[PDB]
Every structure is written in structure tokens, then in C-alpha cells.
From a paper:
The gene coding for ExnV1 may be part of a truncated gene that originally encoded a [name]. A novel structural motif, SβαR, that was not previously associated with DNA polymerases I was identified in the solved structures of ExnV1 and PolI_[name]. Residues 152–185 are missing in chain B of PolI_[name]; however, the residues corresponding to those in ExnV1 are present and from the sequence alignment it is interpreted that PolI_[name] also resembles ExnV1 in this area, which is part of a novel structure motif (SβαR) that is discussed further below. The major difference between the two proteins is that ExnV1 only comprises the smaller 3′–5′ exonuclease, whereas PolI_[name] also includes the larger palm domain that is responsible for the polymerase activity. The SβαR structural motif consists of two β-strands followed by two α-helices that are connected to each other via a short β-strand.
Since ExnV1 only includes a 3′–5′ exonuclease domain, the gene encoding ExnV1 is most likely to be truncated. The maximum activity of PolI_[name] and GoTaq was measured at about 70°C, while IsoPol BST+ exhibits maximum activity at 65°C. IsoPol BST+ also exhibited significant activity at temperatures below 40°C, whereas PolI_[name] displayed very limited activity below this temperature.
Author numbering: 2 to 161, 179 to 726
Write the structure that this text describes.
């Protein structure tokens, strides 16, 4: 491997090599307080790695700096590095995490997302093995046979305890290269650099406060460029493997080019744009949460006052302090200790408290107050978690111009759904009537109301009507399920009418009124039974009676029998082939087999399964996970497909619209007020379709906040 550190003199040769390269890889080395929030004023680009072949790369130092001694070469001018990247973009480009690197290039070098589109090994390799980690380090060990070296390297003698050796940097680089056969780890590189400066501090060479700082800017470029350049060469080497795999699977090659890479691009642009944040409304949520956390402590106090009487004065902060808490629950109330900490003290944790909301205390008369007391503690920690996750940890991250840049990981689930972070939009409570009535402390805590559309802009939101049921009927292919969905009939009333055999003449509207709570028991089944259903799952999860569970499950399969036969074939094909192929998209959902069974003849499998109960537990969990992913993953790709198609049409019609967020069965676009009209039209046209004869419909809304 040839590692080049580019200088003003070497730049024309690096440009010549890039121009001649058949395909190039781009990797960025950066620094920030949050190196992920590129939009904070402290964020900086340190260097750019450009690999022209799997064995040749060029490092462009941009913001490297000198620690105590003068060893760094002159950083290249920002315009020189930008011209190198622009020349590299003319050739076919490959990235490992294009969503990050393309946003780095746009923020630090002003190279718009328009120019920076390229291939992404991390996205393509997710189609090769979704159960494999996304890490470039991890994939390099898996396909390229290159483990990272995490040994402890000790430096050569850089002194002669009086004079620094003139060639000390060449001596240090050579000590590093002697152990770099498969490539040194970042931790090991830091340890050697720190050890080298510590030897210098022990001699009279340098005098620094304490330890060497963990700052890539200070790592000598001659050594650091080896690390950075290996990442770019490994990305290119991994792409060679991807092209071979795509030869074997042209259905996945087309799924990658038409849906996966374009959807990644759409969501990279969405993170880049960022949603505007109402800081005033955030303070109201923060102040309302803070008020309610305090409210819940007074509730706990008045409850404790009745629970332990006059001894309740002897406790000032029972909820917060786990000292006063374990004394109350166990020592005083006589609660059965069904969990302890590593140090053997009785555990007052979230998990342990969930258990005591079934269990009972010594005086069974105090039980309704003890229940109320633990419920107050649950609500207290519930409200307390909302603050520590999204009021302050959401306000920290807001860029100078008040926008929040939510990250989306296009390949963030084994099913194929998008992951979301900073903020995880899934874990933002959309205050649904059931969500609230279960956990009522959420009432009024609308976090999405603080996510605002810019002045002159609107949010055009569109939600797939009862998608889970549509997708279920589509993937399974039950005609009864499909026809009811197309006829707009209450699928749940059809289930309850078959499971209980009551009122076989009350229309779907009349049945809802008369046998109300039996229709809602079927509404639970129609949704939970798609992901594999047994009487055990209905009881050990929903609190169903043994009589009720059998009534419902026999009716669900009597009414929609193709669901049963479909489910039989999914579990049968998974047990034999070890994977399933997605109906319309062709995504392969492979099973995450236990380490035993991996590279083992199927005839040798029963020996493993029949003996090892841990491996069989992994096997059967992996089997259910694949079946579940067939439904979530199918709708994930349907939504992904709609996003790229609607976004392509906004671009085509010259509209000021861009898909800003997507969560659950919902797509939100940030559109200019005049364009909102047509944006909503395009949204519904690209969203509504007829999957396997099952009709998908979607109703649009013009919101000014992401709120519900």
C-alpha cells in the first residue's frame, strides 16, 4: 500500500492520479464537541482521505496542529483541498457512510449535496448482511481479512536525555509501521503518540501539564495519514466485493440503485436542511415537565403520609433518593425483594418497580395506596426521563440559526426501516388516546409542537391510512382481509363476529356500539397476531382469559385463513433456506444464526439444537424476528419508495419542497406556502397505490408544527 501526504508541491501529481483513477473513495477526518453535529460553530474538517486504488491513497491535511514541538507540515489551503475534491467527484465516487461524509463536504468545503452524490459501501453491504455491524472496521475484518492492531506499541529512543534526535519523527513513524501489518487501531495510535511525548517529558525535551491530548489535529500527519488513508483504501477494496455480490444478485443491485441509495440521499438532504425550533415552546414544555415532576413528589408524600403515618416526616425526598426508597418499600411496607443490585442492596430500579405493580405488601389493606405510591414513582421517573432526553439534550444540539438536524440512518434496521436519532422520532410521544390513558403524565407534553415550519413555509404531512393491516393483507395475500379493507369495513368487527359468534347481523357500525369491548379485544388480535400468534402470547402479554384467547385465535384464522397458510410457509422456508425474499422489493432477510450452526452442515444442526438450549433459543428468536421483519420491512420499503418518487417530482416541477421527516406510517415535507398546494397533490399520488390488490390510501394535512 502506498500512502501519500499531499503538499503544495505534490498536489499536481495527486490530481493526476485522481484524474486517472477508475473509481475513487472519499473519507473525512473531523473534530467537534459533538463531532456528529456538523452544524455547531466548533465543528472543523481536519483532513481528507482520497483513495485512487485499494493500494494507493492521498491525504490532504487541512487543520492539523503542533503540540509543543514543530512537526506538522503546512496545512493545505482550503481552496486547494476543495479543488482536489471537486476533481475527485468527476470520477465514480464511493463512501463508507455517505450521509456523514457528504454533509461534511458541504459544510466544510461548500460542495453541495448535488455534486457529492456517490456509492455507499455501508448501504450496499447492509443488503449483503443486515445482521452485520455497519462499522467500516468490522466489515474490513469480515471481507478484507484485516483485523485492527490493538497491541501496545512502545516508542523508540527519541533522545540523546539531552538532545531531541533529528529524525525523531521518522523513528516514531517506523515504530508504528513495524506493527501495522493489518492496520493499527485509533486507541493504539493514541497510546504510542502519548507514550512518545511522555518519554520526551521525562527527559528535558518538553514540559507539558499532564498527559498527551486525544486530539487527531495533534497526531503527526506522517503517522495519522496512514490511519486515515487505510479507511479510504478499505472502502474501495470493500466496493470491489460489493460489485461481485451485485453480479450474483441483480435484484438487490436494482433495489440498491433505485430505492436504497436515492432514499439515503433524500434523508441526507433532510438532515442537512434541519427543522426550525420554537425555543419559547421548548421552555414551556421544560417548565411543564419540571412542574409535573414536582407535583408527583407531593403525591408520593401525601401517599407515604397515609402508608407509614408519622414516620413519613422522616423522609424528605423519597422518590429521588434510593436510600429513603428501599427503606420505605421493603423495610417499612413489607414488600417481597424480587431483585437486588450488584452490591446486594435491595434494588429500587425501573425493572424492579414494574414487578411490585403486580405484587402486594405486608398489610394487604395498604395495597391500593402502595400501588398508587409505586405508580407515582413510575410517573416521576417517566417525566424525569423526558427532560434528560429532549428539552436539554434537544436544546444543546440546536445550531446557531435555531435549526435541529435530526439524523436518519437509511440502513438502521434489519427489517429495512429507517433509524432516527438526535432526536429519535420514534421515541417522541405522539399523545395517542391509549398512550396517554395508559401513562397519563404525558397529557399536554407535546414535544413535536416545538418543531416548527419556517415563516413562509408549511408542513405538508401525509399519513398512510391503517397501513399495518393493508401490508398484512398484501404480504399474506388473504382475500377476505383485502376485500374488507377495500370495502372500508371494520376488520375488527369482522374478527369479533367470528371469534365470539355474537350478532351476525349487526353492521360494522352497530356492532361497535353493542358488543364494544369484544370488538376492542379483536382490535388487539388483528394487530398482534400478524407477528406470529399463539394463545400463550395473547395471555402472557395482554392479560386475556384462557377461554377468550382460544375464542379469538380460532376466529382470526377461521375468518382470514390464508394468513395461517402464509405463516406456515414463512416459518417453513426460514427453517430450510435460512432467509426470506421481500414480496415486491426483493430484499433478503437472513437469519442471525448462533455461532454454532454458522458454517455447519444442516445434518449436524439437530445435534446442536437438541443439546444446546441457548443456541436453540437464539435460533427460534431469529426465526420469529425474520417473520416479523417481513411485515415491517415490506412497509418500510413501500414508504422509502414513495419518498424517493415524490421528492423526484418536487425536483422535476421546480418546487420548494423537500421531505423533512418520516416516522411511523407518516411522511412530512417542508414546502413553500405557494407550492404546498401541488406538494400535497404529488404526495398523495406517489403515496397511494394497490399492493397485491390491497389498496393504499393517504390523507394529507397542512400543519405549521410536526405536532398531533
Amino acid at each position: 500500500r502506498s500512502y501519500h501526504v499531499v503538499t503544495n508541491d505534490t498536489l499536481p501529481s495527486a490530481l493526476d492520479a485522481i484524474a486517472q483513477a477508475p473509481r475513487v473513495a472519499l473519507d473525512t477526518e473531523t473534530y467537534g464537541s459533538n463531532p456528529f453535529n456538523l452544524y455547531l460553530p466548533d465543528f472543523r474538517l481536519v483532513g481528507v482521505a482520497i483513495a485512487t486504488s485499494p493500494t494507493e491513497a492521498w491525504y490532504f491535511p487541512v487543520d492539523h496542529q503542533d503540540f509543543l514541538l514543530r512537526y506538522q507540515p503546512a496545512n493545505l489551503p482550503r481552496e486547494a483541498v476543495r479543488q482536489a475534491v471537486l476533481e475527485a467527484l468527476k470520477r465514480p465516487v464511493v463512501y463508507h457512510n455517505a450521509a456523514y461524509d457528504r454533509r461534511v463536504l458541504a459544510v466544510t468545503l461548500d460542495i453541495p449535496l448535488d455534486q457529492t452524490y456517490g456509492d455507499d459501501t455501508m448501504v450496499a453491504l447492509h443488503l449483503v448482511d443486515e445482521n452485520h455491524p455497519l462499522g467500516l472496521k468490522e466489515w474490513a475484518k469480515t471481507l478484507l481479512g484485516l483485523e485492527e492492531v490493538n497491541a501496545d506499541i512502545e516508542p523508540p529512543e527519541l533522545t540523546d536525555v539531552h538532545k531531541l534526535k533529528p529524525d525523531w519523527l521518522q523513528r516514531l513513524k517506523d515504530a508504528f509501521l513495524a506493527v501495522h501489518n493489518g492496520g493499527v487501531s485509533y486507541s493504539a495510535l493514541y497510546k504510542l503518540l502519548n507514550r512518545a511525548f511522555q518519554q520526551l517529558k521525562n527527559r528535558g525535551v518538553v514540559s507539558y501539564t499532564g498527559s498527551f491530548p486525544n486530539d487527531f489535529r495533534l497526531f503527526p500527519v506522517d503517522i495519522a495519514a496512514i490511519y486515515a488513508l487505510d479507511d479510504a483504501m478499505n472502502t474501495l477494496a470493500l466496493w470491489e466485493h460489493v460489485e461481485v455480490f451485485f453480479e450474483l444478485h441483480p435484484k438487490l443491485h436494482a433495489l440498491y440503485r433505485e430505492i436504497e441509495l436515492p432514499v439515503n440521499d433524500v434523508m441526507t438532504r433532510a438532515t442537512h436542511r434541519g427543522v426550525l425550533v420554537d425555543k419559547e415552546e421548548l421552555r414551556r414544555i421544560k417548565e411543564t415537565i419540571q412542574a409535573r415532576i414536582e407535583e408527583k413528589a407531593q403525591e408520593a408524600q401525601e401517599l407515604l403520609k397515609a402508608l407509614i403515618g408519622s414516620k413519613a416526616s422522616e423522609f424528605t425526598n423519597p422518590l429521588n433518593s434510593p436510600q429513603q426508597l428501599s427503606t420505605i418499600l421493603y423495610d417499612l411496607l413489607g414488600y417481597p425483594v424480587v431483585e437486588t443490585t450488584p452490591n446486594g442492596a435491595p434494588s429500587t430500579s425501573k425493572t424492579a418497580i414494574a414487578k411490585l405493580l403486580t405484587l402486594s405488601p405486608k398489610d394487604k389493606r395498604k395495597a391500593p395506596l402502595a400501588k398508587a405510591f409505586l405508580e407515582a414513582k413510575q410517573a416521576h421517573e417517566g417525566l424525569k426521563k423526558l427532560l434528560s432526553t429532549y428539552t436539554d439534550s434537544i436544546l444543546e444540539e440546536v445550531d446557531p440559526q435555531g435549526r435541529l438536524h435530526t439524523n436518519f440512518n437509511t440502513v438502521g434496521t434489519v427489517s429495512g426501516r429507517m433509524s432516527s436519532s438526535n432526536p429519535n422520532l420514534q421515541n417522541l410521544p405522539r399523545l395517542l388516546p391509549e398512550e396517554v390513558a395508559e401513562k397519563p403524565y404525558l397529557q399536554g407534553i407535546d414535544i413535536r409542537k416545538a418543531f416548527v415550519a419556517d415563516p413562509g413555509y408549511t408542513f405538508v404531512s401525509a399519513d398512510y391510512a391503517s397501513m399495518e393491516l393493508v401490508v398484512c393483507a398484501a404480504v399474506s395475500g388473504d382475500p377476505t382481509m383485502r376485500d374488507l379493507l377495500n370495502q372500508g369495513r371494520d376488520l375488527h368487527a369482522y374478527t369479533a363476529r367470528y371469534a365470539f359468534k355474537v350478532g351476525l347481523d349487526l353492521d360494522d357500525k352497530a356492532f361497535k356500539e353493542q358488543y364494544k369491548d369484544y370488538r376492542q379485544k379483536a382490535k388487539v388480535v388483528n394487530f398482534a397476531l400478524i407477528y406470529g400468534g399463539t394463545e400463550f402470547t395473547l395471555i402472557k402479554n395482554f392479560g386475556f382469559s384462557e377461554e377468550e384467547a382460544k375464542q379469538l385465535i380460532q376466529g382470526y384464522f377461521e375468518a382470514y385463513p390464508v394468513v395461517k397458510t402464509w405463516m406456515e410457509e414463512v416459518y417453513r422456508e426460514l427453517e430450510e433456506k435460512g432467509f426470506v425474499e421481500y414480496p415486491i422489493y426483493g430484499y433478503i432477510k437472513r437469519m442471525d444464526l448462533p455461532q454454532a450452526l454458522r458454517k455447519l452442515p444442516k445434518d449436524k444442526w439437530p445435534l446442536v439444537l437438541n443439546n444446546d438450549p441457548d443456541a436453540r433459543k437464539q435460533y427460534y428468536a431469529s426465526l420469529r424476528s425474520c417473520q416479523n421483519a417481513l411485515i415491517q420491512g415490506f412497509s418500510a420499503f413501500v414508504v422509502k419508495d414513495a419518498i424517493v418518487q415524490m421528492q423526484r417530482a418536487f425536483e422535476a416541477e421546480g418546487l420548494d419542497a423537500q421531505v423533512i421527516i418520516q416516522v411511523h406510517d407518516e411522511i412530512v415535507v417542508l414546502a413553500k406556502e405557494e407550492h404546498a398546494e401541488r406538494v400535497a397533490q404529488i404526495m398523495v399520488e406517489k403515496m397511494e397505490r394497490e399492493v397485491n390488490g390491497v389498496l393504499l390510501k393517504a390523507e394529507p394535512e397542512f400543519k405549521r408544527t410536526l405536532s398531533k
